[PDB]
């Protein structure tokens with residue numbers, strides 16, 4: 058069937074949207090080429106509608122069913138708990154979109170009786186009714202990039218009351234099942250370093266390693282009614298409370314499979330027969346589905362000792378080469394299979410023979426050296442989007458603070474230590490706002506984070522190594538440098554200078570601020586202070602930071 062059908066009503070915005078980067082007194086210290094940075098808006102959603110709208114054919118064979126049966130056997134070992142209304146309420150982000158039934162995110166969080174009542178009545182309707190399509194809102198995401206212009210991405214989500222019910226029903230499943238079904242292929246169980254560890258061990262466990270990422274064209278749109286029912290039959294394999302079995306079947310029929318789309322104004326826009334981007338099971342379902350399809354395809358294309366790493370719609374395979382000609386021909390077959398399974402490619406896939414060239418989850422493995430001279434592997438990416446967003450966040454307060462997320466996930470990197478950290482700690486000092494907790498996203502989930510805790514976080518996730526890395530590779534250095542010429546970011550000798558000031562200012566405050574100066578900015582000085590383990594390190598509740606994926610699933614931890 059058709060992924061979408063459209064009545065012709067436009068995708069409308071809530072507030073005014075800004076596409077040109079806002080500029081303040083801090084901007085020029087980061088970025089001169091302001092017109093290179095933009096925010097997508099509802100206004101360009103027609104371009105997106107065009108490309109995500111197509112017909113889907115699907116042809117499922119034995120490799121496909123065999124693997125599905127392998128997955129179900131694992132899922133039948135899983136036991137999920139039905140969350141309480143209160144518990145699901147606590148998992149709602151504070152900035153989550155308000156209900157049309159007259160209550161909001163905070164009324165959910167602080168547990169007001171009006172919100173709890175409506176939620177209960179939504180649950181009860183869910184238990185009694187398994188057919189009635191559930192209303193959803195379609196919006197355009199405001200995201201920020203550098204010119205490469207991309208149309209706004211679409212977000213489709215049900216009402217706040219449904220979103221809470223989803224959590225009651227499925228939060229435990231989507232946190233627990235993916236790991237059991239897909240084992241070490243489940244990308245979201247990994248921190249950055251654990252991911253490098255897995256990619257490196259996988260790579261080097263092959264005689265002659267060949268790897269490739271697979272870029273599906275609009276994964277969401279390629280997901281069919283079949284796919285959604287299949288993944289439901291996977292959820293159903295779990296040991297569940299009778300009320301959870303029921304809610305899951307009903308949410309599958311009324312919501313996950315398809316449903317009407319309403320704009321922010323109340324007008325009807327059309328109908329959806331593919332994955333909704335804004336539901337709880339978005340991450341988990343895409344993952345299970347991508348894995349199911351790629352595992353089968355790898356069999357259909359006779360790939361040798363193939364190892365998969367899956368994150369939502371993001372897929373990378375590492376296997377044994379047969380030479381460039383047989384490798385070239387293996388992937389076309391792999392891609393034909395994926396195509397039959399309704400997962401056609403964007404850019405066709407290309408074999409890589411050097412791990413550092415493999416881009417997956419928008420990151421690559423790279424190498425630098427620790428204080429001992431001991432070669433160390435770490436994860437990095439092209440910093441263009443991180444820096445484009447840092448620019449936006451320099452001038453505008455935002456619901457999610459990506460600069461802080463980028464420091465947590467990309468601490469060992471050159472561009473995150475020398476730029477992100479220097480620039481933003483410089484800003485927090487001027488506002489005296491070091492002690493203030495900020496919101497940031499990790500694998501789709503919102504975390505409230507105190508900047509002063511960064512050293513301990515970084516030590517826990519990356520080891521003291523991360524405060525000592527040096528002699529980065531020429532490929533990494535070049536990309537960072539080339540990215541700065543593009544954006545008009547000051548050269549790295551300026552940031553070193555700024556960082557000496559930023560560090561000394563921090564040392565002066567004493568306490569946590571001086572711990573920040575000592576560890577985050579040790580790189581900046583000629584004669585370095587000695588970095589030992591940190592007393593307060595083993596105090597943070599880092600449980601559930603890298604358990605599962607939650608993107609579009611409206612989750613707060």
Ligand SMILES: COc1ccc2c(c1)S(=O)(=O)NC(c1c(O)c(-c3ccccc3)nn(CCC(C)C)c1=O)=N2
Pocket residue numbers: 247248249250252340343368369370371418419420436459461462463466498499500501502606607608
């Ligand atoms: C639609 O399916 C998805 C596919 C891929 C997804 C995600 C969803 S995600 O859960 O939004 N987060 C990430 C993700 C990040 O959010 C982030 C990230 C970046 C900056 C700030 C916070 C998180 N980083 N990486 C790379 C590092 C890890 C693979 C070790 C990511 O892959 N990737």
